[PDB]
Design a protein around this ligand. Structure first.
Ligand SMILES: O=C(O)c1ccc(C(=O)Nc2ccc(O[C@H]3O[C@H](CO)[C@@H](O)[C@H](O)[C@@H]3O)c(Cl)c2)cc1
Length: 158
């Protein structure tokens, strides 16, 4: 089991870290959601699907910077939504193919009442998402740590 990103980096068997750079909507209004879709950013596969079934969760999602100070919201993982920043580990998604498969995570972030002007700065860390991979074969339990950065400013109009 290993993963790759839309920025051309990887995390191998056994886990590790990577940076992810996301283009964000430049304007998000109060009462609306900024969508941060990681399924177009992070892709993984199973290295021995003939025998082994891989299981993958979002173990943890944390907010930083302007997201932490100016937004609330949720994370959608494989069709179900949960609070973000996270308060539990999600259910597992099965990876059962050598073919790349997106990691089905998206953040839905809404600006808090006090937000205005530039609410997320270009280049800033917005989130850390921890993917936890196990299987039905051995005792492997690996963390793939995704540091999510904004590629651009996000403004919340007054
Ligand atoms: O035809 C043959 O002779 C043959 C075929 C296959 C193998 C084999 O044993 N292959 C093999 C490949 C990868 C393996 O582990 C990694 O990938 C799995 C599946 O994603 C992960 O769950 C796991 O955490 C880890 O990342 C493991 Cl334990 C085993 C040996 C011999």
């Amino acid at each position: 089991f290993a993963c790759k990103t839309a920025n051309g980096t990887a995390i191998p068997i056994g886990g590790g870290s990577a940076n992810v750079y996301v283009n964000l909507a430049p304007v998000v209004n109060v009462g609306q959601n900024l969508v941060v879709d990681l399924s177009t950013q992070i892709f993984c596969h199973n290295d021995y699907p003939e025998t082994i079934t891989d299981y993958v969760t979002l173990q943890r999602g944390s907010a930083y910077g302007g997201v932490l100070s100016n937004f609330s919201g949720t994370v959608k993982y494989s069709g179900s939504s949960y609070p973000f920043p996270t308060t539990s580990e999600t259910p597992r998604v099965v990876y059962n193919s050598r073919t790349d498969k997106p990691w089905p995570v998206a953040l839905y972030l809404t600006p808090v009442s006090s937000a205005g002007g530039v609410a997320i700065k270009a280049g800033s860390l917005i989130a850390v998402l921890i993917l936890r991979q196990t299987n039905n074969y051995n005792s492997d339990d690996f963390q793939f740590v995704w540091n999510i950065y904004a590629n651009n400013d996000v403004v919340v109009p007054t």
